[PDB]
Amino acid sequence: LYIQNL
Amino acid sequence: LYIQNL
Amino acid sequence: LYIQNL
Amino acid sequence: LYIQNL
Amino acid sequence: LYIQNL
Amino acid sequence: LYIQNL
Amino acid sequence: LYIQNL
Amino acid sequence: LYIQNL
Amino acid sequence: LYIQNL
Amino acid sequence: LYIQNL
């Protein structure tokens, strides 16, 4: 599970 | 589980 | 579990 | 468990 | 458990 | 499992 | 498991 | 497990 | 396990 | 386990 907010 | 907010 | 806020 | 706030 | 606030 | 990004 | 980023 | 970043 | 970063 | 960073 990989979550990135950029 | 990887969470990054940038 | 890895959490980074930048 | 790794938490970093920068 | 590693917590860093910078 | 609940995930929300806003 | 609950994850929210805002 | 509850995670919130705001 | 509860984690909140604000 | 409770963790809060503010």
Residue numbers in the entry:
A (entry chain A), B (entry chain A), C (entry chain A), D (entry chain A), E (entry chain A), F (entry chain B), ...: 1 to 6
Study text:
In the present work we therefore synthesized the Trp5Asn mutant of LYIQWL and found that it forms a purely class 3 amyloid crystal structure. Crystals grown from both solvents contained β-strands of parallel orientation, but arranged in different amyloid topologies. In the monoclinic crystals grown from the ethanol containing solvent system, strands arranged in the class 3 topology could be observed, while the orthorhombic crystals grown in the absence of ethanol contained strands arranged according to the class 4 topology. While the class 4 structure did not contain any solvent molecules, the class 3 structure contained both water molecules and two ethanol molecules, one in a solvent channel near the chain termini and another wedged into the steric zipper interface. In the class 3 topology (monoclinic crystal) the same faces of the chains interact with each other, thereby forming two distinct zipper interfaces, namely that of Leu1, Ile3, Asn5 of chain #1 with Leu1, Ile3, Asn5 of chain #2, as well as Tyr2, Gln4, Leu6 of chain #1 with Tyr2, Gln4, Leu6 of chain #2. The assembly is stabilized by a hydrophobic cluster formed with Leu and Ile side chains complemented by “pure” Asn-Asn and Gln-Gln H-bond pairs. Finally, ethanol molecules insert themselves into the zipper interface through the formation of multiple H-bonds with both Gln and Tyr side chains. Tyr side chains also interact within the steric zipper interface in the class 3 crystal structure, here again with a displaced face-to-face geometry. Accordingly, we found strong and complex Asn5↔Asn5 and Gln4↔Gln4 interactions in the class 3 structure of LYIQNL, as they form H-bond networks “with themselves” in all three directions. However, it should be noted that in this crystal, the ‘odd interface’ (formed by Leu1, Ile3 and Asn5) is a dry one, that doesn’t contain a solvent molecule, and therefore this molecular architecture may be stable even without the ethanol molecule present.
Aggregation-prone-motifs (APRs) of proteins are short segments, which – as isolated peptides - form diverse amyloid-like crystals. We introduce two APRs - designed variants of the incretin mimetic Exendin-4 - that both display crystal-phase polymorphism. Crystallographic and spectroscopic analysis revealed that a single amino-acid substitution can greatly reduce topological variability: while LYIQWL can form both parallel and anti-parallel β-sheets, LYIQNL selects only the former. We found that a simple change in crystallization temperature or modest changes of chemical composition of the solvent system (therefore the available interaction partners) can prompt formation of significantly different nanostructures: we identified four different polymorphs of the LYIQWL and two of the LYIQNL APR peptides.
